[PDB]
Design a binder for this molecule. Structure first.
Ligand SMILES: [Ca+2]
Ligand SMILES: [Ca+2]
Ligand SMILES: [Ca+2]
Ligand SMILES: [Ca+2]
Ligand SMILES: [Ca+2]
Ligand SMILES: [Ca+2]
Ligand SMILES: [Ca+2]
Ligand SMILES: [Ca+2]
Ligand SMILES: [Ca+2]
Ligand SMILES: [Ca+2]
Lengths: 635, 635
């Protein structure tokens, strides 16, 4: 701020001046009469400035004091104001000042070293992590649920704030420092004093009297956040230091100086398929051994850790895609992966809590944990694009994509509002709603996927395409193969010839309708991600409508693939074999191999496909966080 | 949006094109082989554009159709694409198009006539009022609490949205229009169809099938909001129209076109003392008759309606300042005053509900209505500045000011968070927290007030000032009047001489502490309102500390005044009479009369002052809304 000090010939005034502060003088209000003019003299540590030699006694004339160093003792710098007139001997008013340093410091330039918070690479303000992992090897709670620092590792997650004082040795005889946080925000932050660590602010306490010695002192605090940005929390936390005059034992304490630091809490951020893979997840269940070896091979080729959830934990839930999504949070001092656990709560319910969350692995959940849910809350319906720039505006972390109905009806489904709100409140991947409710299961992974590409924007959008499959199949009939059988290679499955598929008119009608649902999203994506046709590749894929006229995959849904860098784990369509090969596999390879991609076709037919999901639905991936720092975006 | 239409020689395609939409053609995906090139011919109502005569068959070549007018009948515009090659006779693919107009329209230029919402005088987007008055002369509920329009006057409060269609006469045989709102927002808006009015959207229904005839039609809707901007509602409401293809009786309906309008809900806005007065409020209680005549005179001189709450309604609550604050809401079509009713809930509890709310007078309340409250929730602690510009940034409606503690402790008080959040969420008067908890009662009206001024910025900030009173009194002792008595003119009150007041050292100590509390706010206001010293006038005023060392007025608190334009109703200090006059009254007049202000001193001593409030605390004012339109600010 800056104080105004009123001087009088009546008696000398005494005041504290905090370094970095504007200190001003009122000289006219008690200037004795007789008097026209004034002079100022001050000791060498005080700098005096006068805008608007000696001056007239005009109240508009501005006098300011700044002090070059902290005082060694109380009142060791002096100012003397001299009032005089035509025939009037000078009269002196004295001001004894004590200068002190009070710097509340934090990593506001976002470099790991120690007003307002602003975004961008020219912005300012410190970052704070939600301490939502479990460095504590003992219990089952996120580190930030108690009021203690139980491991020293835990401190690496926290943000350092330092209070730095320089005062006379007896200064805190008559002054006291208090650290505080608004009641509004105290349930979202916890601050520890490092003396060993003890809580000074938190849900329970919004202010704390500090024990500070006179002289030079540095006091380190460690800060953790306890809540992510959300509908009712924009994500900023302000911590303030107040200096109080406690000189007078009869009067209340009086505020002399306040300063603040403002932290932003780090958002939860997702990683698209174009980010290098690091660890792969799946379930082992009855009779799925061979699916797992293909997944194991592919992981091995992509240099990835593998992690499997045995049927004793699964409780027969094979849909490892659906219960969780692995993102990260990121600060200059620390980055760590964090699982967003879906309120789905089927047999994999425990897996995120028990097996994923842990040392340097965070946890978050949203939405009601018993009931009130739908299929659209499963995380095969939560995806994210690669980085894109859309008509000037940069999304350097991509944009989250999730499925919805085209309008709300009695029969429509949506992702739960609490999830939607959470995702929007993370800001930095500005979500886009797509249309997926036309699918029986209802998930955006059922019709799109993204893959790396060495040119253009770095990727291609893959979309399922009936059109592409009708064209492929018609082509084959044209060159003589109308007799060729879909489902060749499968036992207890009624083969169908290309010619009967092309001539089946209901099937063609169903796929026309699907074609419209997908086209609609195509244009939506083109608009909201700034894609051109040359960004998109259509994957040949047939559907059929079933209960409530909702769409299912006619043969294994190849777009529902596992993307591990250049290694793809694509569901095996079992298409008509022509010239030694499945023409579907051949058509796909012809579209993906020129991008450097390797397609491995995995058999998931009686294991996954007949339970209405594929390879992507049965797996999950943790991937490398972006290198671009989220705080440098201007959302 | 814009659709992409896939053409084939296989058979002709049929499609709808909504006017104002980008329609594009895919010509290559089913271009038969043999073929190198293509030509397009179309009927006269279709405009064809080709970037990147006749053209090669390059998939990157872009073909777009726009249509100049609505179709008179289905498929009445045609496009014919001709594929040909070196030795290949042309083959034609046909496209039959039907053009329609679907305009969902609203007052987006904010002029009373009928994407996104943007602020400022070059921004765009319609405005919507919370229908929080009671035009219904019967009951006691805000108009917007039921699902009906009961008076035709009620419609003046609502926003008009018009759907405007032009189609073939049979168009809605195979298509249907649905109007909707997100489930997220359905509890905040209610939409009526004007056929008489009936509800089509609201808390109960998020989508409605519209009954629309073919041909030209215009359908009027009337919209009301039901919630103000708040912590969990940024204030935007989007209403969407979707066009569905219902051609196929076997398949689900298919979305063809969506469009939206976005409304912003009007914030609750306060009016500073510098806005011309219109109506004045007070209580009649036992033995306060003479206070009321002075208030009556002053109202009369300011051309103001007067309104009094008799003791049968008061229930002995005389503090008309404290239970309510009169603001307004404003849209291009309608502006009306709205009372913000404090959760104080003492004897005036009913007054806002029963007597203020009514035809063209709105109502709002926040915070818990039983308990959990403090003195700081009373609306003498809610004020607003005149318009100001602060280091470039304009606050054309001023900034709300309300009192707080300097930091939260076990003994500190604050205005309830729900009030604070509500006020911030109104955006346009960006609240400032001041320090008022040092006062026994705790209200910013106890130390500041604002008054019109014919120069400078249009106003002066008045602040209570012990310094000013010590200087006045010392001056008088200097010119011979140390014997003069404070409380001259009062019976059952112990007079005190100027000389004993100047020499009372505890009193001087108490006022030094008060002086610091006020100085602290002085600088705060100077910073947050961009004030200079020449904006501020100090009013001579003494205090004393009492229970819990909290401050009370030593003599009647003159800053706690009724400002009715140039007519001021200032508490009568009963200061020492010197040369025929109260020297306090004289000092005040000397400071205010040069600004054109007229000071009337009202006796409130045994009626108000001894119950720890003054004239401002015993009254309230409705004032003229600003002329500057809130939506033109860029907050
Ligand atoms: Ca802990
Ligand atoms: Ca930790
Ligand atoms: Ca779960
Ligand atoms: Ca950790
Ligand atoms: Ca997912
Ligand atoms: Ca109504
Ligand atoms: Ca109304
Ligand atoms: Ca009330
Ligand atoms: Ca009305
Ligand atoms: Ca007020």
């Amino acid at each position: 701020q800056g104080t105004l000090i009123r001087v009088t010939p009546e008696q000398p005034t005494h005041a504290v001046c905090v370094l970095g502060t504007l200190t001003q003088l009122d000289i006219c209000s008690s200037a004795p009469e007789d008097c026209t003019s004034f002079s100022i003299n001050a000791s060498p540590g005080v700098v005096v400035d006068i805008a608007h030699s000696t001056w007239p006694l005009d109240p508009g004339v501005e006098v300011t004091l700044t002090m070059k160093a902290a005082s060694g003792s109380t009142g060791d710098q002096k100012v003397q104001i001299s009032y005089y007139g035509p025939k009037t001997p000078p009269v002196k008013a004295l001001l004894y000042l004590t200068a002190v340093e009070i710097s509340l410091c934090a990593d506001i330039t976002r470099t790991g070293k120690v007003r307002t918070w602003t975004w961008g690479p020219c912005g300012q303000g410190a970052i704070l992590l939600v301490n939502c992992d479990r460095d504590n090897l003992e219990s089952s709670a996120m580190d930030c649920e108690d009021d203690e620092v139980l491991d020293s590792e835990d401190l690496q997650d926290m943000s350092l704030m330092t209070l730095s004082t320089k005062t006379p040795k007896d200064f805190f005889t008559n002054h006291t420092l208090v650290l505080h946080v608004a009641r509004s925000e105290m349930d979202k932050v916890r601050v520890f004093q490092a003396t060993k660590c003890s809580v000074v602010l938190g849900p329970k306490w919004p202010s704390h009297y500090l024990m500070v010695p006179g002289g030079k002192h540095n006091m380190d605090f460690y800060v953790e956040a306890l809540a992510f940005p959300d509908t009712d929390f924009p994500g900023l936390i302000t911590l303030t230091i107040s200096l109080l005059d406690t000189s007078n034992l009869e009067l209340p304490e009086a505020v002399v100086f306040q300063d603040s630091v403002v932290f932003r809490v780090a958002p939860w951020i997702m990683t698209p398929n174009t980010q290098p893979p690091q660890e792969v997840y799946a379930c082992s269940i009855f009779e799925n051994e061979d699916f797992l070896k293909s997944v194991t091979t592919l992981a091995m080729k992509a240099k990835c850790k593998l992690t499997i959830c045995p049927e004793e934990e699964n409780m027969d839930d094979q849909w490892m895609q659906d219960e969780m999504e692995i993102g990260y949070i990121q600060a200059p001092h620390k980055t760590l992966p964090v699982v967003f656990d879906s309120p789905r709560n089927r047999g994999l319910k425990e897996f995120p809590i028990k097996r994923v969350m842990g040392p340097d692995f965070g946890y978050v959940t949203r939405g009601p944990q018993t009931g009130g849910i739908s299929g659209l809350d499963s995380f095969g319906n939560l995806e994210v694009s690669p980085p894109v720039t859309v008509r000037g505006k940069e999304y350097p972390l991509g944009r989250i994509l999730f499925g919805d109905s085209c309008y709300p009806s009695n029969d429509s489904r949506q992702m739960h509002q609490a999830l939607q709100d959470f995702l929007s409140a993370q800001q930095v991947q500005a979500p886009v709603k797509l249309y997926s409710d036309w699918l029986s299961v209802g998930h955006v992974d059922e019709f799109l996927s993204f893959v790396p590409a060495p040119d253009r924007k770095g990727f291609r959008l893959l979309l399922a395409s009936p059109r592409s499959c009708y064209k492929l199949f018609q082509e084959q009939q044209n060159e003589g193969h109308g007799e060729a059988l879909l489902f060749e290679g499968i036992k207890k499955k009624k083969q169908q010839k290309i010619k009967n598929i092309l001539s089946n008119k209901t099937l063609r009608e169903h796929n026309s309708f699907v074609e419209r649902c997908i086209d609609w999203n195509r244009e939506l994506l083109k608009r909201e991600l700034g894609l051109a046709e040359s960004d998109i590749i259509d994957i040949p894929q047939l559907f059929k409508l079933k209960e409530f006229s909702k769409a299912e995959a006619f043969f294994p849904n190849m777009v529902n693939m596992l993307v591990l860098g250049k290694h793809l784990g694509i569901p095996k369509p079992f298409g008509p074999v022509i010239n030694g090969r499945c023409c579907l596999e051949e058509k796909v390879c012809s579209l993906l191999e020129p991008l450097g991609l390797q397609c491995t076709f995995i058999n998931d037919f009686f294991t996954y496909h007949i339970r209405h999901g594929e390879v992507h639905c049965g797996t999950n991936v943790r991937r490398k966080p972006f290198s671009f720092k989220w705080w440098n975006m201007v959302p």
